[PDB]
Amino acid sequence: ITSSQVREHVKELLKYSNETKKRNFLETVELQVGLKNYDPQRDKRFSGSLKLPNCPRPNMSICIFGDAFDVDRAKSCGVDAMSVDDLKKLNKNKKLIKKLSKKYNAFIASEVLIKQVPRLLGPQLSKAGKFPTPVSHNDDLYGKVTDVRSTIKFQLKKVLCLAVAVGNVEMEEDVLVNQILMSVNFFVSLLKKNWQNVGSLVVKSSMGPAFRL
Amino acid sequence: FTFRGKGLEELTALASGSNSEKLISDELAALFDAKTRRRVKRGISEKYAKFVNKVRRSKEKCPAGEKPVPVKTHYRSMIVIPELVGGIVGVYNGKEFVNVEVKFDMIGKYLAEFAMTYKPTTHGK
Amino acid sequence: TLAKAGKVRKQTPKVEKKDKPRKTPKGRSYKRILYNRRYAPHILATDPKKRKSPNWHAGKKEKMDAAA
């Protein structure tokens, strides 16, 4: 709870383990949070790294599609399909628009809708996990998929999600919790007023918990 | 740059052909609608022939001063004959006689089709 | 109105009166004739219930002769 105990989630919580000495292999810590919890559309992000610094952790197939040319916008990589003859029948509704825009990351496709997005395609998907975000959709979905694959930084969109990092095993305290904060930027604060907008969260590394608030 | 149906002249030769007997030679027959063909092929009157000549004199005698002598008739049942074009015939309707300048287009059509028989309705109350 | 005074009489065709063929006896004579034409025994003779009207002779020339 943004208090002294931050370094109790960090410093005092960095060698908890669950057995004997402390092992003999590398470490793996971070600092959990989110993306903005807005609705993955209107306003929740912009630009600027923390860091932070990471990438996947497990899988990365997100979202990118629109026309017959959006497939190759997911061929030399791996993404979801919006289909062509579906935006007039079933390419969006609940578990539909989901499918294409409901993965884990967010979305990195382009744009093309017309008079249909106030309760179907572009619509039903927003806070679900996608609704047309900033993925430099013009050359494709790879270069700006540096904001959708690796490096990172920590593009935090769709539904929660983000990253963190600072050191290895044991050598951080005030800058461990203050490294977790450092592992937060346009995700912990931003422009006009943004020093906080949530309730709680989690964190650790592999040991056991962090802040007991 | 405007022309006319089937050649106003071909018909004067078609109508007044070798056998310019019955006002409507069997030639003109091929041209008219079934209803008209019916009538002529059935039993057309002779009066319709003396009326014919009455227009004739009106068309020539009149100087190029384009002032035709109106020919008066009740034969509203007459179907304009080719040679009947150009003359202004006064046709009775119910009240008086109607003067109509015969154009090439009103042939094969009933002479009555122009003598308005009733004044349609204007309104107010 | 006013000018509409006597509209009737003015519009009436003045017929003349039948210039007395002879005379009308005035005196005991008239009362006599009447006595004879009505209360004379030949009329009091036939039923008093079936005797005629002293003016059914409205001057009808057709019934005037039938009686006399």
Binding site: - | - | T1, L2, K4, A5, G6, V8, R9, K10
Partner: protein, 141 residues
């Protein structure tokens, strides 16, 4: 007994009673109250007068008609009189300002069923009986 008293000594009573209960009669109450003298003729049977103007009056209830009438000025009395001119052409003889002789119509009071407020008849024009002027062979001026 009945209301009336039957005493040989009570004649007076019965007498006064009759003199009293008798006022209930209009015919009585009428002549008794010198009423006849106050009318336009002052009791009189007839009256002379000057024609003030020939006016016409409308019939009443089931009848609709223009009655001929003369407004007269009685001589010694000096009153406005409503006088009905009799038979057909009659009013054609009455010249305005002439002298006229008037009499009532059936008992001085109600006018003939037809007339409205007229109570008089016209019998003479310039002192010439109307009937006389009504029949050609009689008189005219």
């Amino acid at each position: 007994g009945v209301g009336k008293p039957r005493g040989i000594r009570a004649g007076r009573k019965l007498a006064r009673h009759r003199k009293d209960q008798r006022w209930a009669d209009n015919d009585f109450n009428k002549r008794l109250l010198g009423s006849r003298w106050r009318n336009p003729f002052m009791g009189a049977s007839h009256a002379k007068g000057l024609v003030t103007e020939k006016i016409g009056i409308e019939s009443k209830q089931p009848n609709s008609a223009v009655r001929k009438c003369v407004r007269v000025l009685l001589r010694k009395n000096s009153k406005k009189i409503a006088a009905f001119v009799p038979m057909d052409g009659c009013l054609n003889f009455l010249a305005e300002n002439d002298e006229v002789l008037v009499a009532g119509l059936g008992r001085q009071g109600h006018a003939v069923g037809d007339i409205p407020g007229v109570r008089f008849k016209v019998v003479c024009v310039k002192g010439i009986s109307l009937l006389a002027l009504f029949k050609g062979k009689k008189e005219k001026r």
